[PDB]
């Protein structure tokens, strides 16, 4: 049962990905950072909208994300 991953709150405007911490199959949980995002003079981070594992992601490091954007597709466990 897949689920989508959006970008919650990243303070302002538009940001890009500097460190895409998780990958295709990883173990993610809320509050546990997902992707480190940049854009101005500061460095920001984006945690997990919810918990489970990662399945697929049409995003790169140096690519763009902003509030709502479909970061990647998760699937809430799936007895690996």
DSSP assignment of 27-68 equals: EE-BTSEEEEEESSSS-EEEEBSS-EEEEE----TT-EE-TT
How many domains in the chain? 1
**Residues 6 or more apart from 35 whose CB is under 8 A from it?**
17, 19, 20, 21, 22, 45, 46, 59, 65, 71
Closest C-alpha among 59, 33, 65, 32 to residue 46: 33
Give residue 78's domain range. 1-80
CATH code of 16's domain: 2.40.50.100
């Amino acid at each position: 049962m897949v689920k989508e991953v959006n970008v919650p709150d990243i303070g302002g405007d538009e940001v890009e990905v500097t460190e895409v911490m998780v990958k295709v199959g990883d173990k993610v949980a809320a509050e546990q950072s997902l992707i480190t995002v940049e854009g101005d003079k500061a460095s920001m981070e984006v945690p997990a909208p919810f918990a489970g594992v990662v399945k697929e992601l049409k995003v790169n490091v140096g690519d763009k994300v902003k509030t709502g954007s479909l970061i990647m597709i998760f699937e809430v466990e799936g007895a690996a």
